[PDB]
């Protein structure tokens, strides 16, 4: 570890890599260090839930390569190891370069001293710092209250090791349970159902909502998505609240708060993510209370020489207000912006970030802005229509704050993202939405 | 007037003057422009309610001079007019200077181009900017729902013009009624009661709590302060919720919720302060929701080249969380810090700020930290009365968050600020608040 670096990037993930590329682009000859707790080079997580599961290659868990939108095979890793220079070489190599320090954890942050302390005891002084620590999966209360053997048969799905372990388990066990109905739980349910269709094993999804992804989509769309997920070979059990999890004859037993009971062999828990804010206690950094994570301004700035990007950043969007987004594209855009601002720009967060999803062949969408179930929605579909506050195969769902669009879900329509982005950018008063819904040309 | 200014300070008051002084101290040769909507040069407010009333000099309204703790007469203004340079003279002068552009209001703030627009259409481009606007007095629903005649007879007390108007009114009218029982209301009640006792007129105070300063002091000290204010010649009416204000035979009449009716011919309204945050709408600046005002960090910074100081800043205290202090000492300290940080330092707010108050001769106190009656309270007096949330001439009050001292009120003891400041600095847990009050000479 070098004793001083011009640019420090805490956490090795999407945001840190994007920031390193921006810093290198704007300031040629910059010398960037990335301190990562994972023993791996930066990689993208989205393939860990969809693409690596549908790969035809048998030995994919060891290879980690997949086909793209075009179909050209690529790796999850952002860059090959030859791209990164050694940390010791970093302050000596010509025109700089990015170096990655893997297996290291920053445990202390002295803002005034412009210093951090690693887990092994090494101390690194910086000129500019980015905190791009992400989040960690939340555990279940009933699972925690159970014994050690119950926790041994539970899985939290974030990293590559989780993907490999879950793939081997699905190959070797007879039934797996998914708890949670958000993004990760639903995608895992679809992938595991696809894998289990061949042999004929059982996969179960149970959660306390009315349907799949009930915090994002309206009720009717949630029920439609639930039915589509059931069509993939998954037994979905909505409105289920876990009371206790136990052991019976070598199989774990789920006793719900209701009268229903479930007996299976393995549990996958996808019950949310919480940001890593253990570093704020020693850094004297403010933690947001409404959203969680570090609190930063419109330029993602926490202190004089400290920026925060990614999932842990509770930033201030000027158009939409205080936010905290947890998505791949937001991590890329936010890291790019923080890298621009670390070299000397003063740009606020302006370009909006989107996200995408695919819950099987039938369901596939992209969304932008503020998308939430509590906010008023206007669903203009094809062959159907519904507004809140049957053939829902195609359509657009506007989200309105005060007669103004703040988020758009584009349901099974493609190459119509710029229209939605321009609608969000203009931010006009919209008392009528069928006049604008024709721009996407749903029919 | 100049097209480009290195250092712009929006709003000229206590914080702006302190910031200009810090800028000049750290960076000799600087060129500071102060844009103020007032027609006057910066002055200090605290003597506008206490010192200028007790002066024996007849024409203090014009001189605006008063005596102090040392006893040396000084002006209400921070500096004499010769100290400042002209606005057109600022760009080209050896070692620069400070120029105040009085009577001009900043109406638009464009952070993208680093340019502001004044109310006369002139544009000024800045390199660093400070927003040191203050607050404006809050009005009353009963007053605002009334007619123009009732509005013309009520007073909101912030500036020098209000002080002159109220002094003339006190010399003229027979009865004065004061709404509000916080700091300003109690101080004006004491001053006008002294003047009335000197003359022989009537002064009345009404507020919706059970005692004076019930949002700062505990209940028993609130009752004690209410009694002591009554001894000053002021008829105090606690628990008076105002319903409507009207006129009857050329005299104002107040009808309260409980049924009491009070007649008078002038009203002084002092019911709080609302921060000036109209610049945030056009500047893309974030306004705090819990406390109000511009939301800044521990370094009092809002954007890349923008700092906020004074009563309008909702800053983050590392040791005490989110705060918004509205006091003269805090304005001085925060303006000083923001002026230092505009020149290159990155110092967070660490030095605490205190506040004092004198309510007659018997009651005089100082306070520091988080002082609020909502927090659990332990008071050490001649008889040790601990509050759960006799003679109380002298004592100390500790305010607790959870077994930790966050604010201390010093009751009729002086030259003991450093002890309380040191106690608050190292906020370690205490088994009981006693044996700590021994540090103060009770
Ligand atoms: C299985 C899966 C599938 C996903 N699919 C999608 C998708 O299809 N679309 C989408 O938009 N989003 C998707 N996401 C979300 C997206 O991947 C995340 O939002 C994104 O990875 C967040 O990037 P980040 O850099 O903020 O955090 P992360 O990617 O979590 O990186 C955080 C890194 O920082 C390290 N770290 C933390 N604390 C410290 C410390 N103190 N010291 C050192 N290192 C530290 C961690 O170990 C980790 O390596 C998916 C996520 C998962 C898990
Ligand atoms: C009568 C009175 C007595 C007080 N007594 C005490 C006391 O005994 N002890 C104590 O601790 N505190 C006391 N205070 C409180 C203390 O005086 C204030 O908290 C302090 O003055 C706040 O300073 P500031 O610089 O933030 O605001 P201010 O002093 O209000 O300065 C704001 C200035 O900015 C100007 N401005 C506003 N908007 C704009 C704009 N858009 N463009 C240009 N200029 C603008 C305003 O006109 C004003 O000149 C008293 C206050 C009053 C009114
Ligand atoms: N396609 C995508 O964009 C995508 C895909 C995968 C993951 N992700 C990200 O991964 C992260 C983690 O995913 P996640 O799905 O775990 O997050 P999430 O926030 O979607 O998970 C919350 C889900 O768990 C349920 N839940 C909450 N508490 C519960 C409890 N006590 N018992 C049972 N159910 C409970 C909620 O009602 C909801 O269904 C998120 O940041 C998410 O955005 C995104
Ligand atoms: N000694 C000092 O520190 C001092 C002295 C004077 C002024 N100041 C400052 O001057 C500013 C103005 O003082 P203030 O006394 O107006 O503010 P304040 O916030 O102290 O006033 C609160 C008082 O107004 C009362 N009130 C609120 N709403 C009311 C309503 N609808 N009807 C009746 N009463 C109502 C409250 O009950 C309380 O008695 C404050 O910022 C204060 O800090 C400080």
For residue B278, the 8-state DSSP code is T
Q: Are residues B299 and A304, on separate chains, in Cβ contact within 8 Å?
A: yes
Euclidean distance between CA atoms A358 and A190, whole angstroms:
9
Resolution (A): 2.8
**CA–CA–CA angle A273, A279, A284 (5° rounding):** 125
Q: Is A158 annotated as a binding residue?
A: yes
Centroid of chain to Cα A73: 23
Of A45, A42, A43, A33, the residue nearest A7 (C-alpha): A33
Nearest C-alpha in B relative to A316: B286
Ligand 3: atom nearest CA of A181 is 39
Q: Ligand 4, closest atom to CA B209?
A: 37
Is A278 known as a binding-site position? no
- Residue B120 — φ and ψ, nearest 5°? -95, 5
Contact B302/A297, CB-based, under 8 Å?
yes
Least Cα separation, residue B318 to chain A (angstroms): 6
Instruction: List CB contacts (< 8 A) between A115 and chain B.
Output: none
Q: From CA A157, how far away is CA A254, in angstroms rounded?
A: 20
Count of C-beta atoms within a 10 Å radius of residue A240: 21
Compute the half-sphere exposure of residue A123: CA atoms within 13 Å on the CB side of its CA: 6
User: What residue spans in chain A does CATH classification 3.30.390.30 cover?
Assistant: 354-437
C-alpha to C-alpha distance for B294 and A124, rounded to whole angstroms: 34
> Which ligand 1 atom is at minimum distance from the Cα of A15?
25
Contact B286 A297 (CB under 8 A): yes
Report the distance separating Cα A62 and Cα B216, nearest Å: 67
Probe residue for ligand 1, chosen from A14, A37, A45 as the CB with the greatest number of ligand atoms within 8 Å: A45
Cα-flanking dihedrals φ and ψ of residue A413, to 5°?
-130, 145
Given B298, B304, B348, which is nearest A299 (Cβ)?
B304
Residue with tokens 């987004």: A325
Selected residue of A286, A305, A317 to mutate for chain B interface (largest B Cβ count, 10 A) = A286
**CA B321/CA A309 separation, integer angstroms:** 23
Q: How was this structure obtained?
A: cryo-EM
Residue A32, strand partner residues: A7, A98
- Which bound ligand lies closest to the C-alpha atom of A185? 3
Q: Which residues lie below 8 Å from residue A267, measured CB to CB, with a gap of 6+?
A: A143, A150, A153, A154, A155, A176, A177, A179, A245, A252
Alpha-carbon gap, residue B224 to B238, rounded angstroms: 13
Radius of gyration, CA atoms only, chain B: 23
* CA-to-CA separations, B4 to B122, B127, B302, in angstroms, rounded: 11, 8, 21
As a whole number of angstroms, the distance between CA B302 and CA A154 comes to 45
Residue B127 has φ and ψ, to the nearest 5°, of -100, -35
Cβ atoms < 10 Å from Cβ of A393 = 15
CA distance, residue A346 to nearest chain B CA (Å): 6
| B139-271: CATH architecture | 3-Layer(bba) Sandwich (3.50)
Q: Kindly state whether A127 is in contact with chain B, defined as any CB-CB distance less than 8 angstroms.
A: no
Q: Which of A37, A137, A337, A339 to mutate to test the pocket of ligand 1 (most atoms within 8 A of CB)?
A: A37
Nearest CA to ligand 4 atom 7: B184
Ligand 3 pocket test: pick from A52, A183, A226, A314 the residue with the most ligand atoms within 8 Å of its Cβ.
Answer: A183
**B418/chain A closest Cα distance in angstroms:** 25
Pairing of strands A135-137, A154-156: unpaired
Q: 3-class DSSP state for residue B220? A: helix
Contacting residues of A for B316, CB less than 8 Å apart: 286
Q: Whose CA is nearest to atom 6 of ligand 1?
A: A46
What CATH superfamily classification does B4-43+80-136+274-341 receive? FAD/NAD(P)-binding domain (3.50.50.60)
| CB-CB neighbors (< 8 A) of A303 in chain B | 297-299, 346, 348
How many Å apart are CA A302 and CA B255, to the nearest integer?
Answer: 52
CATH classification number, B354-425, choose in 3.30.390.30, 3.40.50.9100, 3.40.50.970, 3.90.1200.10: 3.30.390.30
How many angstroms separate the CA atoms of B182 and B176, rounded?
Answer: 17
Does B289 contact chain A (CB < 8 Å)?
no
Between chains, do B297 and A303 touch, taking CB under 8 Å as contact? yes
* Å from CA of B139 to ligand 2 middle: 17
Which residues of B are less than 8 Å from A302 in CB distance? 297
Task: Label each residue of chain A as H, E or C.
Answer: CCCEEEEEEECCCHHHHHHHHHHHHHCCCCEEEEEECCCCCCECCHHHCCCCCCCCCCCHHHHCEECCCCCCCEECECCCHHHCECCCCCCCCCCCEEEEEECCCEEEEECCCCEEEECCCCEEEEEEEEECCCEEECCCHHHHHCCHHHHHCEEECCCHHHHHHHHHHHHHCCEEEEECCCHHHHHHHHHHHHHHHHHCCEEEEECCCCCCCCCCCCHHHHHHHHHHHHCCCCEEECCCCEEEEEEECCEEEEEECCCCEEEECEEEECCCEEECCHHHHHHCCCECCCCCCEECCCCCEEECCEEECCCCEECEECCCEECCCCCHHHHHHHHHHHHHHHHCCCCCCCCCCEEEEEECCCEEEEEEECCCCCCCEEEEECCCEEEECCCCCCEEEEEECCCEEEEEEEECCCCCHHHHHHHHHHCCECCCCHHHHCCCCCC
Pairing of strands B123-131, B306-308: parallel
CB A42 within 8 A of CB A13: yes
Selecting from A284, A302, A316 the residue whose C-beta is nearest the C-beta of B318 gives A284
Task: Flag whether residue A91 sits within 8 Å of chain B, measured between CB atoms.
Answer: no
Contact A286 B297 (CB under 8 A): yes
Nearest chain A residue (CA) to B296: A297
The residue among B199, B197, B276 whose CA lies nearest residue B235 is: B197
| Residues contacting B82, CB < 8 A, separation 6+ | none
| Rounded Cα distance, A113 and A126, in Å | 9
Measure B27 CA to nearest chain A CA, in Å: 20
And the tokens for A190?
């679809």
| Closest approach atom of ligand 4 to CA B327 | 43
Interface test with B, best of A284, A294, A297 (most B CBs within 10 A): A297
Of B39, B5, B11, give the one whose Cα is nearest residue B277.
B11
Instruction: Report the alpha-carbon distance of residue A175 to residue A253 in Å, rounded.
Output: 12
Q: Does A103 touch chain B (CB under 8 A)?
A: no
Structure tokens of B193?
Answer: 């009661």
Decide which of 3.40.50.40, 3.40.50.720, 3.30.390.30, 3.10.180.10 is the CATH code for A354-437: 3.30.390.30
Cα–Cα distance for residue pair A109/A285, rounded to 1 Å: 10
CA angle A349, A353, A358 (to 5 degrees): 165
Q: What is the CATH number of domain A4-43+79-136+274-343?
A: 3.50.50.60
d(C-alpha B422, C-alpha B420), whole Å: 5
Q: Which of B302, B318, B346 sits opposite A304 (nearest CB)?
A: B346
The CA-to-CA distance between both ends of chain A, in Å, stands at 59
- Is B299's CB within 8 Å of A302's CB? no
Measured between alpha carbons, how far is B209 from A177 in angstroms, rounded to an integer? 59
Sequence ranges of chain B with CATH classification 3.50.50.60: 4-43+80-136+274-341, 139-271
């Amino acid at each position: 570890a070098p004793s001083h670096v011009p640019f420090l990037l805490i956490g090795g993930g999407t945001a840190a890599f994007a920031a390193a590329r921006s810093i290198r682009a704007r300031d040629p000859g910059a010398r960037v260090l990335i301190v990562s707790e994972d023993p791996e080079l930066p990689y993208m997580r989205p393939p860990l839930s969809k693409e690596l599961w549908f790969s035809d290659d048998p030995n994919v868990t060891k290879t980690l390569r997949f086909k793209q939108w075009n179909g050209k095979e690529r790796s999850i890793y952002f860059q090959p190891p030859s791209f990164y220079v050694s940390a010791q070489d970093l302050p000596h190599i010509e025109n700089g370069g990015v170096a990655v320090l893997t297996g290291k954890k920053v445990v202390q942050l002295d803002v005034r001293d412009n210093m951090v302390k690693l887990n092994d005891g090494s101390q690194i002084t910086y000129e500019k710092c980015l905190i791009a620590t992400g989040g960690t999966p939340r555990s279940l209360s009933a699972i925690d209250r159970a014994g050690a053997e119950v926790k041994s048969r539970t899985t939290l799905f974030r990293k590559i090791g989780d993907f490999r372990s879950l793939e081997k388990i699905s190959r070797e066990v007879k039934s797996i349970t998914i708890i949670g109905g958000g993004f990760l739980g639903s995608e895992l349910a679809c992938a595991l159902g696809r894998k289990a269709r061949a042999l004929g094993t059982e996969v179960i999804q149970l959660f306390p909502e009315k349907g799949n992804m009930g915090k994002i989509l309206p009720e009717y769309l949630s029920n439609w998505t639930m039915e589509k997920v059931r069509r993939e070979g998954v037994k979905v059990m909505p409105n289920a609240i876990v009371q206790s999890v136990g052991v019976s004859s070598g199989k774990l037993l789920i006793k719900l708060k209701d009268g229903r009971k479930v007996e299976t062999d393995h549990i996958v828990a996808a019950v949310g993510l919480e940001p890593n804010v253990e570093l704020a206690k020693t850094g004297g950094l403010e933690i947001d209370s409404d959203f969680g994570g570090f609190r930063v301004n419109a330029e993602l700035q926490a202190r004089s020489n400290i920026w925060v990007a990614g999932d842990a950043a509770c930033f201030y969007d000027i158009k939409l207000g205080r936010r905290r987004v947890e998505h791949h594209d937001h991590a890329v855009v936010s890291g790019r912006l923080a890298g621009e601002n670390m070299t000397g720009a003063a740009k606020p967060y302006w370009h909006q970030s989107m996200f995408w999803s695919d819950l099987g062949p039938d369901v596939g969408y992209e969304a932008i802005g503020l998308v939430d179930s509590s906010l008023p929605t206007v669903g203009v579909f094809a062959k159907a229509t519904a507004q809140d506050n049957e053939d829902y195969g195609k359509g657009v769902i506007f989200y309105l704050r005060d007669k103004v669009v703040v988020g758009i879900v584009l349901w099974n329509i493609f190459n119509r993202m710029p229209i939605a982005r321009k609608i969000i950018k203009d931010g006009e008063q919209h008392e009528d939405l069928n006049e604008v819904a024709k721009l996407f040309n749903i029919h």
